[PDB]
Amino acid sequence: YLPITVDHIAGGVEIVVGDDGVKEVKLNIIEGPRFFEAITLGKKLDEALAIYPRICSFCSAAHKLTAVEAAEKAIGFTPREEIQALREVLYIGDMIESHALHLYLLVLPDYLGYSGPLHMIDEYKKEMSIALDLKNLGSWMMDELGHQENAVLGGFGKLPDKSVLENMKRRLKEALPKAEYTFELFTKLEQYETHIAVKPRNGVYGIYGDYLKASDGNEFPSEEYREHIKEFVVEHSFAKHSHYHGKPFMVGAISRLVNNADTLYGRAKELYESYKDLLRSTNPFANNLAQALELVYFTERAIDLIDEALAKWPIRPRDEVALKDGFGVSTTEAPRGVLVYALKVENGRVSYADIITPTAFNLAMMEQHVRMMAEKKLKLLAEMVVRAYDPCISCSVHVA
Amino acid sequence: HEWALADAIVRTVLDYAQREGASRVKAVRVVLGELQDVAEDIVKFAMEQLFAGTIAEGAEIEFVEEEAVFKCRNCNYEWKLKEVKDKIHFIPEVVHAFLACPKCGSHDFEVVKGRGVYVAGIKIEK
Ligand SMILES: [Zn+2]
């Protein structure tokens, strides 16, 4: 061929400002999992199941936990209630870790104006103690139940001892008041700083909890529905936004609270009934607080699941038989928001794969959440608006 | 990042094709520095995706990886990365602080080759 030379000069948001006010706000913070969706096909179901947790591995364990569900949902075979509850337990641990980390390491420096080394002795001592306790607890749950390659289709690879489970329950019992304190601390801090306007909330609906569910949650709910995804930013496009019912919508703890309010019970139900006004369906920041509330709820529910798991002392991972031409669409509820896994299997191999992340759902409204009117400083406010949605990683860039 | 880099490549190639008045692109050869932690398959794929809907659709992407060359000025000494490769987790890192000039004892070595990425070959059909 013909050889030439063209030197190519080579994640955050960009807001272009002006003297007459702000004109254009744009973001390219995430990529598409499309690549995986094209390389996981043609491989074994287990192989693809091993490739899947590579996407947003910052919250890895959740993916492989809904993927398998889709697989089961494809083969028609249903897992037992015990192993389902166990999946829900691992899910809970992951939830706890992620939300503790996010809330304390991201939201607390936002409001308290902290930077650099987060560890301080004048303040954030008890808060770092709590945060570390929750992080360690969740990560230990994930290390025990799940390093990796533990969760297999139909039944798990290895199960921990019952004593470890009882001790885990005790640990939760010791961890609850720290989550209550966390909820208090996040009940004290500021909302909308103001960015407060109608945002559709969207979260799954379960019989007892918003952990796992088969029906999408909206003022007009749906069991299996595909919403209009719009390719945007085409000039400087890195991702494609999503429009539910033809409008930018939001997912996250707020959505789960709005949709599954009545399904809630325990201390979390009381705290909700108390702070019912503090978390509005039109404010992005309350989500943080909501997560703290979810740090309480999922702490208690877990125990019940354990008491649901001890219903049968002898436990053995079941096995499933694969089914050809099987469509399975698992819609789980990751900490980031509702996570979507669509898997159609043919000849025991991957035929169709469509995975959608909560971040993509929140992207549209987050772009719409920008009514920020300030004169810089505003980069921090925008960063707080962004961290109110709990992104994997983010940064603010303002062109002047 | 793979997708951003591939997007830069796509936009650049389409722009150049818009400069030379190309009707279609048949093949593209890109030289990449090994300092880049991007995965070749992901970048190739992303290029293949963003080329769709354009005149560069269906082109054959060929990646050529170039080596990294370091040069310390404290003793005017030049060395490579493969030599320091064999001496496991988090093996790749920013060479600015990770490693020194293996001879003198001062880490201020200038990067000459393998840091940048550039398109080498383009098959223009007009
Ligand atoms: Zn030297």
Curated annotation (Swiss-Prot), chain B:
Belongs to the HypA/HybF family. One of its GO terms (molecular function) is nickel cation binding. It comes from the Archaea. The keyword Lyase does not apply. Ni(2+) binds at residues 1, 89. Keywords: Metal-binding, Nickel, Zinc. Involved in the maturation of [NiFe] hydrogenases. Required for nickel insertion into the metal center of the hydrogenase. This is Hydrogenase maturation factor HypA. It holds the Pfam family HypA. Zn(2+) binds at residues 72, 75, 101, 104. InterPro entries: Hydgase_Ni_incorp_HypA/HybF_CS, HypA/HybF. Signal peptide: none annotated. GO terms for biological process: protein maturation; protein modification process. It comes from Thermococcus kodakarensis (strain ATCC BAA-918 / JCM 12380 / KOD1) (Pyrococcus kodakaraensis (strain KOD1)). Monomer and homodimer. Could also form hexamers. Forms a complex with HypB.
